[model samples]
Target: VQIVYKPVDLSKVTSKCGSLGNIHHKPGGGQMEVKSEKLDFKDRVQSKIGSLDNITHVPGGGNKKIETHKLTFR
Candidate 1:
């Protein structure tokens, strides 16, 4: 098995708990690497913030979206 790390810029990635691997609140501005298969947070995670928004996984295990709210980054 091979694990590939894909880097994505989270400049507009607003999310809350349960989105993209149990992440809380809005993530700080920067690039984050996620596993190709898992599509979860891999490395370079500055901090996992609070519950201003929401990110729930769909019925399938390969789709997810982010919900944003007006709140401070934790």
Candidate 2:
């Protein structure tokens, strides 16, 4: 799973945990604005697809080739 991160105001923060310099906390309860990365379908697909190519040897023929998979997320 991919985790998103965002910039936060240390002053308004209610509770904090982890190291001093690098801290993660909640900026009060209720509707709060935070920063985080957004992932798109294309970006996720590309990452999973990566590279493709494969070869195989046929019984009688010199060699055989197989095609890569075409992935589509519904």
Candidate 3:
């Protein structure tokens, strides 16, 4: 699943244990804000659809192949 945000939230993700838990978002492409500090390797950064062929990687070190996901909300 691709998470297209106004900007990426590295810190929030690093601290976040699970998915962006229990948050509200606008419909049909709006904006969501996040703030975090530690995402270095644990950075769960995402990109817009078709923006990048693959998810951003960490130079010589990278993440595993992307997988399919199902999205839901609280």
Ranking by lDDT: 1, 2, 3
- Once fitted onto the true fold, the runs of candidate 3 whose alpha carbons sit more than 4 angstroms away are 1-29, 42-74
Q: Ranking by TM-score, best first?
A: 3, 2, 1
Q: Write the per-residue lDDT of candidate 3 for residues 27-62, one digit (tens) a residue.
A: 455355656666455467763433313243323333
Error of 2 at 40 (Å): 50
lDDT tens string, model 1, 25-52? 5656655454344445679866543424
Q: List TM-scores for all candidates, in order.
A: 0.15, 0.16, 0.16
Model number with the top lDDT: 1
Residue pairs with backbone atoms closer than 3 Å in model 2 (clashes): 6-35
Steric clash pairs (candidate 1) = none
Q: Is candidate 2 or candidate 3 better by TM-score?
A: 3
Worst 10 residues of 2 by lDDT: 53-62
Error of 2 at 41 (Å): 42
As for model 2, its CA RMSD to the true structure in angstroms is: 28.9
